[PDB]
From Swiss-Prot:
S-S bridge residues: C7-C46, C17-C37, C116-C192, C135-C329, C156-C172, C159-C177, C169-C175, C225-C239
Known role: Transferrins are iron binding transport proteins which can bind two Fe(3+) ions in association with the binding of an anion, usually bicarbonate. It is responsible for the transport of iron from sites of absorption and heme degradation to those of storage and utilization. Serum transferrin may also have a further role in stimulating cell proliferation. (Microbial infection) Serves as an iron source for Neisseria species, which capture the protein and extract its iron for their own use.
Keywords: Disease variant, Disulfide bond, Glycoprotein, Ion transport, Iron, Iron transport, Metal-binding, Methylation, Phosphoprotein, Repeat, Secreted, Signal, Transport
Name of the protein described by the UniProt record: Serotransferrin
Keyword Transport appears in the UniProt entry: yes
Native organism: Homo sapiens
Length: 329
């Protein structure tokens, strides 16, 4: 029955957030939940802000959910996105490696190629791919960024430190950590491949379909499978790197307004969910892709009482992330 300060990362999400606020004002009764928009430069500033009681919520890729839980932030997942459809809700998605047809190389031949990542620490764009190549990277493997920059002959790893790891922003100077960087996120990583800046793009299964509407254009891209073979992009179920947890909304563990967050999102998905309204769309926008929430999401599911980041992500996934920051071969 009160205000939820949503954290928007940069200008594009801020605009979508303002529209979200305005439309909710015209559908929700005077005594219903409302939205306020707090603009920050990166997802990292959003995490600090929430922990500092400057904002209340933000949606994060699962990989980033782990960081959010560590002290002194101690945020917890309260609401998760679900994909697929309302009839068959999927609380996970597939991480894939997209390349152009006949580029002439397999998964075990990535050394020296140029890579495009959605962002440092994210599930599909970093943790899965780098987790699988870990023992392929040259030594020392510490720091991780260092060895990654030496494996590929140039890449775009948004949010990485370009001062110490220049090679990680060769394809996107500055390694901007928001949509101001044309190569940020799923669709940014895809564009990086499409434009020809990189040789491979680590994204999710729906990315190409979200960007190329003619099957004729998609037939010019393939997927790299673990068994060093290539398959068409429609065959991701038989050619993916891993299954990762859906993105989730995080909030403070104390005075986190988790009840209001859910009330707001549940009502938001009622009035503005998929195909629900002509005035405003929660899972789409003319100002960009994957703003505030992923375009591929179909709705929200409440997370069980007091579930911590570790239990939510699962031991397996949480294992991989640890093995990446410590890792041995
Ligand atoms: Fe993701």
């Amino acid at each position: 029955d009160k205000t939820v300060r949503w954290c928007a990362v940069s200008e594009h999400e801020a605009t979508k957030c303002q529209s979200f606020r305005d439309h909710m004002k015209s559908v929700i009764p005077s005594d219903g939940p409302s939205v306020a928009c707090v603009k920050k430069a990166s997802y990292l500033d959003c995490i600090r802000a929430i922990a500092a009681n400057e904002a209340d919520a933000v949606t994060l890729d699962a990989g980033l959910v782990y960081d959010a839980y560590l002290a002194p932030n101690n945020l917890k997942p309260v609401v998760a996105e679900f994909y697929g459809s309302k009839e068959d809700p999927q609380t996970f998605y597939y991480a894939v490696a997209v390349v152009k047809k006949d580029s002439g190389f397999q998964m075990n031949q990535l050394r020296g190629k140029k890579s495009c990542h959605t962002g440092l620490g994210r599930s599909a764009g970093w943790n899965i791919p780098i987790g699988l190549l870990y023992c392929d990277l040259p030594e020392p493997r510490k720091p991780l960024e260092k060895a990654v920059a030496n494996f590929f002959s140039g890449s775009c790893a948004p949010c990485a430190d370009g001062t110490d790891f220049p090679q990680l922003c060769q394809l996107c100077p500055g390694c901007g950590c928001s949509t101001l960087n044309q190569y940020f996120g799923y669709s940014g990583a895809f564009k990086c491949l499409k434009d020809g800046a990189g040789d491979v793009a680590f994204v999710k299964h729906s990315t190409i379909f979200e960007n190329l509407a003619n099957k004729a254009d998609r037939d010019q891209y393939e997927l790299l499978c673990l068994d060093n073979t290539r398959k068409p992009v429609d065959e991701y179920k038989d050619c993916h790197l891993a299954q990762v947890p859906s993105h989730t909304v995080v909030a403070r563990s104390m005075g986190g307004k988790e009840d209001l967050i859910w009330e707001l999102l549940n009502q938001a998905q009622e009035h503005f969910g998929k195909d629900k309204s002509k005035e405003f769309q929660l899972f789409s926008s003319p100002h960009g892709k994957d703003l505030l929430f992923k375009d591929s999401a179909h709705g929200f599911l409440k997370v069980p009482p007091r579930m911590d980041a570790k239990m939510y992500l699962g031991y397996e996934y949480v294992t991989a992330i640890r093995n990446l920051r410590e890792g041995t071969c």
